[PDB]
Amino acid sequence: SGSHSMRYFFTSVSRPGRGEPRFIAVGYVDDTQFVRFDSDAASQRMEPRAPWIEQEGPEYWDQETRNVKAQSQTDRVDLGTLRGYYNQSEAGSHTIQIMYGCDVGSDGRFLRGYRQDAYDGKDYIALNEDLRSWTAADMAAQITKRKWEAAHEAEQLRAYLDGTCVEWLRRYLENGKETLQRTDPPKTHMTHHPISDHEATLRCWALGFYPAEITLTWQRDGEDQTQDTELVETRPAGDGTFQKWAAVVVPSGEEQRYTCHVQHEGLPKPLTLRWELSS
Amino acid sequence: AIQRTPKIQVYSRHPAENGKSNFLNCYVSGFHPSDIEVDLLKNGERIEKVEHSDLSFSKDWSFYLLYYTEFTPTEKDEYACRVNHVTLSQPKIVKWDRDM
Amino acid sequence: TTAPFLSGK
């Protein structure tokens, strides 16, 4: 509830006979982007995306550039290797995705570390919660799991996920404490849109909230509506805040039967919204 | 191998008030593979000077992107988002609807 | 900061 996270996301996309793969890396503290690398950008450097990281010195940018450029060269090999494992041709575009990070509690103590890899939009291999073993998703990926077990990659990575990652997360949170400790609860409201003379869409809104996790439910007379609810995916406002809505189509005159329940870390009490007609 | 169709949302950063500057958002998510074309449109015509977020992805591995640009709403002007992806027969246009 | 490289898959 006062817990935080540091995550890096990598995507490598092979370009058949058109040069090197498109590589894009992003790091995040909670839901705030703070670094970026894009193999097609001008700088060819890891670049800052949050003011509180701008402060880091030229050796920090030098080391993050070298490590992220390397990560992409190891993703470029892996695309060729995984093409071999899944017996695919050299003609098609393929994708590797990687995500890794750690979480701390409100007092800065390690909670969790993770690393998850994917090939063409499906699970390939992931590190287990214990941080000392792997789970492969199929028999191709079990080959990777044997290399990494041989080289004891889990134990080097554990030292980062439960050590280095936690110390740098704790620093970024201290260095960025203006930006990062702010929780914004949702500004909620309800709108009403007749479909016809006899029905209308009720839409329950949640606006300007941070961080992105939220729940929106529709109850009719205290019973859930999970089947007739239209839910949209949570979305960025573009100012660092998030938005979502949910809708139910209801018979005209029955609006006051329906409730929209809103849950967010910021909110003291879960909000209950009702469309109340004239008095 | 697996192909997933974009979910397209078109909306303003702040609630729309005629004459006051704002940002126009096109959020595309749930898609695979990552190659995608997104254009914001005013009255049927492409807007240049349109920015986007850095490619990231969700827990299910599907991609998401935010395209945005500064604008001022007016009753007369009509805004849309135009998306092309391998999963779509033709480019999908979604219209900016003021309640959003 | 980014994590140290893993060896090839």
Numbering used by the authors:
A (entry chain A): 0 to 278
B (entry chain B): 20 to 119
C (entry chain C): 1 to 9
The authors write:
MHC class I complexes are formed between human leukocyte antigen (HLA) proteins, β2-microglobulin, and a peptide, typically 8–10 amino acids in length, derived from an intracellular protein. The peptide-binding domain is formed between two α-helices, with an eight-stranded β-sheet forming the base. β2-Microglobulin is a single domain protein with a typical Ig-like fold and binds alongside the “stalk” to further support the HLA peptide-binding domain. Peptide binding is mediated by two anchoring residues, the second (P2) and C-terminal amino acids of the peptide, which bind in pockets “B” and “F”, respectively, and anchor the rest of the peptide. To confirm the binding of these peptides to HLA-A3 and the suitability for antibody generation, we determined the structures of both the WT and mutant β-catenin peptide-bound HLA-A3 (WT/mutant pHLA-A3).
The analogous mutant S45F β-catenin peptide, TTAPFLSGK (amino acids 41–49, hereafter “mutant peptide”), is predicted to bind to HLA-A3 with high affinity (28 nm, NetMHCv4.0 (41, 42)). The structure of the WT pHLA-A3 was determined to 2.2 Å, and that of the mutant pHLA-A3 was determined to 2.45 Å. Both WT and mutant pHLA-A3 exhibit the canonical fold consistent with previously published structures of HLA-A3, with an RMSD of 0.483 Å between them. In the mutant pHLA-A3 structure, all peptide residues except for P5 bind in identical conformations to the WT pHLA-A3. Interestingly, electron density for two distinct conformations of the phenylalanine residue at P5 were observed. In one conformation, the phenylalanine side chain sticks out of the binding cleft, exposed for antibody binding, whereas the other conformation orients the side chain laterally, similar to the serine side chain in the WT structure. The side chain of the phenylalanine residue is not anchored by any interactions with residues from the HLA-A3 protein, making it flexible and able to adapt to binding by an antibody. Both conformations should be accessible to binding, and a single final bound conformation may be stabilized by antibody binding. Thus, the mutant S45F β-catenin peptide (amino acids 41–49) was an ideal candidate for MANAbody generation. We predicted the structure of E10 and then docked it to our mutant pHLA-A3 crystal structure.
